Amino acid sequence: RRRKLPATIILRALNYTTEQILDLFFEKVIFEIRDNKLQMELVPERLRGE
Amino acid sequence: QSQLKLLVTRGKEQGYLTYAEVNDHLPEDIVDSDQIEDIIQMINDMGIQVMEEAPDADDTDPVRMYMREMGTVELLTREGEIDIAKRIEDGINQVQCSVAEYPEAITYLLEQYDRVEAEIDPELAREKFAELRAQYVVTRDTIKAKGRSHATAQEEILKLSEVFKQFRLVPKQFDYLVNSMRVMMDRVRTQERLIMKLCVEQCKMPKKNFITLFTGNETSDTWFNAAIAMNKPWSEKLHDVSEEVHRALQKLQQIEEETGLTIEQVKDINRRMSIGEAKARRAKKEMVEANLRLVISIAKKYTNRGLQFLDLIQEGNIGLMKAVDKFEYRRGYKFSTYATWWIRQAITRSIADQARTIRIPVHMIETINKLNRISRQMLQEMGREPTPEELAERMLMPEDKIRKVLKIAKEPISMETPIGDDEDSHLGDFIEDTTLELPLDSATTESLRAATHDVLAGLTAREAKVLRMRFGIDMNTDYTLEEVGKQFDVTRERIRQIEAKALRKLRHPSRSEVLRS
């Protein structure tokens, strides 16, 4: 019960890099750059309410 | 920006004064008991305008700030320490030699020795003090004889200085002499500053001319009459101060006769003395400054025993400050440990006395600790609590002594201690007053005065006065059978007879009878 700190600071204290931290809460989305254009790994379920 | 905008925009007005909010939204080291009152004060009472006084006022600890300046290490090595100590001894030597140059220091020490003998081997005292007196009387004659124009005569003077340097004087002696010499020099510059203040300012003589003229003899009137006979505009004013300057010169010449020294060099020797003082003092200051670490490091072990950390390390600093005074570089023993003992002694000899409210001698403190250290084993090497009789049996003291010893322990308790935890209790609030008398008691005492005053009314003059004067009432000082028998002619037995007859009269009245109880 002290002054507030970002709850990601404790994660880094547990030897977690920024990249690892992001890969523990969120779902990733890969994009590919082929044939001089931009593609996307589309997931139909994710497009709910957009 | 951040603090001001967040504070104001949020507090509007936080309804129930949500204290536990913005104190987290503040920088610097948190969990303090300093920044607290600065927030409880602003929010309420003088609202609106107070919130504009806060920002304009915003636009810490003893020990932590002590370590700050101490952070300036400047530590030393064996080479470093010896170097500093070498400068100390160098400064001290130059001072003592400057004291040796002073002939009145020798002759005074001589005069005081004759006092000592007029009432450490007594023969060894007669030995060295004679050696000094011998070199003095031989050096003295070569002064007015002027044989060897202060070349070889000077050799005997400096040899006399060496002889004086052989003496190992006491701290009070050296300080008395040096102080006396500085007081002498005070009178010197008193006369010089008098002549300067009088001639330069009052007589309108420029400082250029005064330094060009006075700097010569400074004693004889050869410069003064030459200043008056110079026929300058500032020479005519000197006539209005002739007696003052003459008086100053005569007094300065008197000093020449007191010291028996050339006035044009007393400044020089006294100068070199002051030089040595600054040097030795300086080096000693660097010493204590350098070994400052040692003080705190060892004082840490003595912490929490009726005296706080700051006080302890301060006593350790003065302990270090005394250590540096008694130490020489020409000594195989290092300073790191020698100083340590003086520091331990310094703070331990302070925690002993200036710790508890009530006084206590050192032997009391040691005996008390010894009792505890012995007691901690009796309950651990057996199984049951330490009985006072057996605990005393394990000690040289009888038992009642130990019992009285435990009556001195503890601060003791303070009055402001909560007890019943009411609203709110305090130990000192239950403490009754006994020095005062009951209003009933005071009333009865007054009624007693009236009773006796009215009872002696129903008596005769040569009986009222008798009872009154014997038992001393309404006349302060009470007298005896003789002092009353003399004032009534008939002595002793006659007055005691009447005294007993008055008592016979008071065998019926009930007033004093009930007043008795």
Side-chain angles (χ1 to χ4, degrees), chain B residues 6-19 21 39-48 50-51:
Chain B
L6 292 175
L7 276 168
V8 175
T9 59
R10 288 168 176 163
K12 296 177 66 286
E13 198 243 2
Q14 280 193 347
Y16 17 92
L17 299 182
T18 323
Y19 195 83
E21 280 286 330
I39 300 183
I40 60 86
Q41 62 185 216
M42 297 299 184
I43 49 182
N44 211 264
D45 285 331
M46 304 296 296
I48 299 300
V50 65
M51 302 303 300

Short mmCIF file of all heavy atoms in Angstrom, two decimals, chain B residues 6-19 21 39-48 50-51:
data_model
loop_
_atom_site.label_atom_id
_atom_site.label_comp_id
_atom_site.label_asym_id
_atom_site.label_seq_id
_atom_site.Cartn_x
_atom_site.Cartn_y
_atom_site.Cartn_z
N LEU B 6 -2.84 18.73 -12.17
CA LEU B 6 -3.45 17.54 -11.59
C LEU B 6 -4.14 17.84 -10.26
O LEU B 6 -5.26 17.40 -10.02
CB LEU B 6 -2.40 16.44 -11.40
CG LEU B 6 -1.81 15.83 -12.67
CD1 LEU B 6 -0.70 14.85 -12.33
CD2 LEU B 6 -2.89 15.16 -13.50
N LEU B 7 -3.46 18.60 -9.40
CA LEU B 7 -4.00 18.97 -8.10
C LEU B 7 -5.31 19.75 -8.21
O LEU B 7 -6.31 19.39 -7.59
CB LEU B 7 -2.98 19.80 -7.31
CG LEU B 7 -1.91 19.03 -6.53
CD1 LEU B 7 -0.82 19.97 -6.05
CD2 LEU B 7 -2.55 18.32 -5.34
N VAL B 8 -5.29 20.80 -9.01
CA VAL B 8 -6.44 21.69 -9.14
C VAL B 8 -7.64 21.02 -9.81
O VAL B 8 -8.74 21.01 -9.27
CB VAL B 8 -6.08 22.97 -9.92
CG1 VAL B 8 -7.31 23.82 -10.15
CG2 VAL B 8 -5.00 23.75 -9.19
N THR B 9 -7.41 20.48 -11.00
CA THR B 9 -8.48 19.87 -11.79
C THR B 9 -9.15 18.71 -11.06
O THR B 9 -10.37 18.54 -11.14
CB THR B 9 -7.96 19.37 -13.15
OG1 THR B 9 -6.93 18.40 -12.95
CG2 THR B 9 -7.41 20.53 -13.97
N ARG B 10 -8.36 17.92 -10.34
CA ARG B 10 -8.88 16.81 -9.57
C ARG B 10 -9.68 17.30 -8.36
O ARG B 10 -10.85 16.95 -8.20
CB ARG B 10 -7.75 15.89 -9.11
CG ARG B 10 -7.13 15.06 -10.21
CD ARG B 10 -5.83 14.41 -9.74
NE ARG B 10 -5.26 13.53 -10.75
CZ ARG B 10 -4.00 13.10 -10.73
NH1 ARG B 10 -3.18 13.48 -9.75
NH2 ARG B 10 -3.55 12.30 -11.68
N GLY B 11 -9.04 18.10 -7.53
CA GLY B 11 -9.67 18.61 -6.32
C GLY B 11 -10.74 19.65 -6.59
O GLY B 11 -10.46 20.85 -6.56
N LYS B 12 -11.96 19.19 -6.85
CA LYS B 12 -13.08 20.09 -7.08
C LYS B 12 -14.40 19.51 -6.57
O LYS B 12 -15.33 19.30 -7.36
CB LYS B 12 -13.21 20.43 -8.57
CG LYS B 12 -12.03 21.20 -9.14
CD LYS B 12 -12.17 21.44 -10.64
CE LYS B 12 -13.35 22.36 -10.96
NZ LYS B 12 -14.67 21.68 -10.81
N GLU B 13 -14.49 19.24 -5.27
CA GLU B 13 -13.38 19.45 -4.35
C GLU B 13 -13.00 18.12 -3.70
O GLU B 13 -12.61 18.07 -2.53
CB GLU B 13 -13.74 20.49 -3.29
CG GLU B 13 -12.54 21.08 -2.56
CD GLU B 13 -12.54 20.76 -1.07
OE1 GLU B 13 -13.46 20.05 -0.61
OE2 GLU B 13 -11.62 21.22 -0.37
N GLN B 14 -13.13 17.04 -4.47
CA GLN B 14 -12.88 15.68 -3.98
C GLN B 14 -13.86 15.27 -2.89
O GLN B 14 -13.62 14.31 -2.16
CB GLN B 14 -11.44 15.54 -3.48
CG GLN B 14 -10.42 15.33 -4.59
CD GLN B 14 -9.07 14.89 -4.05
OE1 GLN B 14 -8.81 14.95 -2.85
NE2 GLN B 14 -8.21 14.42 -4.95
N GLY B 15 -14.96 16.01 -2.78
CA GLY B 15 -16.03 15.67 -1.85
C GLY B 15 -15.60 15.55 -0.40
O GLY B 15 -15.66 16.52 0.35
N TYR B 16 -15.17 14.36 -0.01
CA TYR B 16 -14.81 14.09 1.37
C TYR B 16 -13.31 14.27 1.63
O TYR B 16 -12.74 13.60 2.49
CB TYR B 16 -15.23 12.67 1.77
CG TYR B 16 -15.53 11.76 0.59
CD1 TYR B 16 -14.54 10.96 0.04
CD2 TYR B 16 -16.80 11.70 0.04
CE1 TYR B 16 -14.81 10.13 -1.04
CE2 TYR B 16 -17.08 10.88 -1.03
CZ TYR B 16 -16.08 10.09 -1.56
OH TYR B 16 -16.36 9.27 -2.63
N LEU B 17 -12.70 15.20 0.89
CA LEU B 17 -11.28 15.49 1.04
C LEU B 17 -10.43 14.23 0.90
O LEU B 17 -9.68 13.87 1.81
CB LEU B 17 -11.01 16.16 2.40
CG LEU B 17 -11.70 17.50 2.65
CD1 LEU B 17 -11.31 18.07 4.00
CD2 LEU B 17 -11.39 18.49 1.54
N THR B 18 -10.55 13.57 -0.24
CA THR B 18 -9.84 12.32 -0.49
C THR B 18 -8.33 12.53 -0.43
O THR B 18 -7.68 12.72 -1.46
CB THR B 18 -10.21 11.72 -1.86
OG1 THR B 18 -11.60 11.94 -2.12
CG2 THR B 18 -9.91 10.23 -1.88
N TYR B 19 -7.78 12.50 0.78
CA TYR B 19 -6.36 12.71 0.98
C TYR B 19 -5.54 11.65 0.25
O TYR B 19 -4.65 11.98 -0.54
CB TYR B 19 -6.02 12.70 2.48
CG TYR B 19 -4.66 13.27 2.80
CD1 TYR B 19 -4.47 14.64 2.93
CD2 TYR B 19 -3.56 12.44 2.99
CE1 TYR B 19 -3.23 15.16 3.23
CE2 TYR B 19 -2.31 12.95 3.29
CZ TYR B 19 -2.15 14.32 3.41
OH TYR B 19 -0.91 14.84 3.71
N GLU B 21 -4.88 10.24 -2.35
CA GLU B 21 -5.06 10.35 -3.80
C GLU B 21 -3.85 10.98 -4.47
O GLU B 21 -3.10 10.31 -5.17
CB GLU B 21 -6.32 11.16 -4.12
CG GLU B 21 -7.61 10.38 -4.01
CD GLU B 21 -7.81 9.42 -5.15
OE1 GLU B 21 -7.32 9.70 -6.27
OE2 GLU B 21 -8.46 8.37 -4.95
N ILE B 39 -0.48 19.69 2.85
CA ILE B 39 -1.63 19.39 2.01
C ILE B 39 -2.94 19.48 2.80
O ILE B 39 -3.96 19.92 2.27
CB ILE B 39 -1.52 17.99 1.37
CG1 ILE B 39 -0.26 17.90 0.51
CG2 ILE B 39 -2.76 17.67 0.55
CD1 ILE B 39 -0.10 16.57 -0.21
N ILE B 40 -2.90 19.07 4.06
CA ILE B 40 -4.07 19.13 4.92
C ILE B 40 -4.43 20.58 5.23
O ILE B 40 -5.57 20.88 5.60
CB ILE B 40 -3.84 18.37 6.25
CG1 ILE B 40 -2.65 18.96 7.02
CG2 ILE B 40 -3.60 16.89 5.97
CD1 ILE B 40 -3.01 20.13 7.91
N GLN B 41 -3.45 21.46 5.08
CA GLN B 41 -3.62 22.87 5.42
C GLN B 41 -4.34 23.66 4.32
O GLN B 41 -5.17 24.52 4.61
CB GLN B 41 -2.26 23.50 5.70
CG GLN B 41 -1.32 23.48 4.51
CD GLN B 41 0.07 24.00 4.85
OE1 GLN B 41 0.71 24.66 4.03
NE2 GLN B 41 0.53 23.70 6.05
N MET B 42 -4.01 23.35 3.07
CA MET B 42 -4.49 24.14 1.94
C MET B 42 -5.94 23.85 1.56
O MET B 42 -6.73 24.77 1.38
CB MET B 42 -3.59 23.90 0.72
CG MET B 42 -2.15 24.34 0.91
SD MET B 42 -2.00 26.11 1.24
CE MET B 42 -0.22 26.30 1.27
N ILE B 43 -6.27 22.57 1.44
CA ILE B 43 -7.56 22.13 0.91
C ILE B 43 -8.79 22.86 1.47
O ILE B 43 -9.66 23.28 0.71
CB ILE B 43 -7.77 20.62 1.15
CG1 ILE B 43 -7.46 20.26 2.60
CG2 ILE B 43 -6.88 19.81 0.21
CD1 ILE B 43 -7.58 18.78 2.91
N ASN B 44 -8.84 23.02 2.79
CA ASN B 44 -10.02 23.61 3.42
C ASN B 44 -9.73 24.95 4.10
O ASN B 44 -8.72 25.59 3.82
CB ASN B 44 -10.60 22.63 4.44
CG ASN B 44 -12.11 22.76 4.59
OD1 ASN B 44 -12.60 23.45 5.49
ND2 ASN B 44 -12.85 22.10 3.71
N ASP B 45 -10.64 25.36 4.98
CA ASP B 45 -10.52 26.62 5.72
C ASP B 45 -10.59 27.85 4.82
O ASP B 45 -11.62 28.53 4.77
CB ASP B 45 -9.22 26.64 6.53
CG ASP B 45 -9.28 25.75 7.75
OD1 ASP B 45 -10.39 25.57 8.30
OD2 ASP B 45 -8.23 25.23 8.18
N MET B 46 -9.50 28.14 4.12
CA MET B 46 -9.43 29.34 3.28
C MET B 46 -9.55 29.00 1.80
O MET B 46 -8.74 29.44 0.99
CB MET B 46 -8.12 30.08 3.53
CG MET B 46 -7.89 30.45 4.99
SD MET B 46 -9.11 31.62 5.61
CE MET B 46 -8.76 33.05 4.58
N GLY B 47 -10.58 28.23 1.45
CA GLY B 47 -10.77 27.74 0.10
C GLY B 47 -10.73 28.78 -1.01
O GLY B 47 -10.82 29.98 -0.76
N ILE B 48 -10.59 28.30 -2.25
CA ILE B 48 -10.53 29.14 -3.44
C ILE B 48 -9.19 29.86 -3.56
O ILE B 48 -8.37 29.51 -4.41
CB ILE B 48 -11.66 30.18 -3.47
CG1 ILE B 48 -13.03 29.49 -3.49
CG2 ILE B 48 -11.52 31.09 -4.68
CD1 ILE B 48 -13.23 28.58 -4.69
N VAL B 50 -6.74 29.95 -1.32
CA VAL B 50 -5.66 29.13 -0.78
C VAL B 50 -5.07 28.23 -1.85
O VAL B 50 -3.88 27.91 -1.82
CB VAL B 50 -6.15 28.25 0.39
CG1 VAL B 50 -7.16 27.24 -0.11
CG2 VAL B 50 -4.97 27.56 1.05
N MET B 51 -5.90 27.83 -2.81
CA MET B 51 -5.47 26.95 -3.89
C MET B 51 -4.63 27.72 -4.91
O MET B 51 -4.08 27.13 -5.84
CB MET B 51 -6.68 26.31 -4.57
CG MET B 51 -7.55 25.50 -3.63
SD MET B 51 -6.64 24.19 -2.79
CE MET B 51 -6.05 23.23 -4.19
#
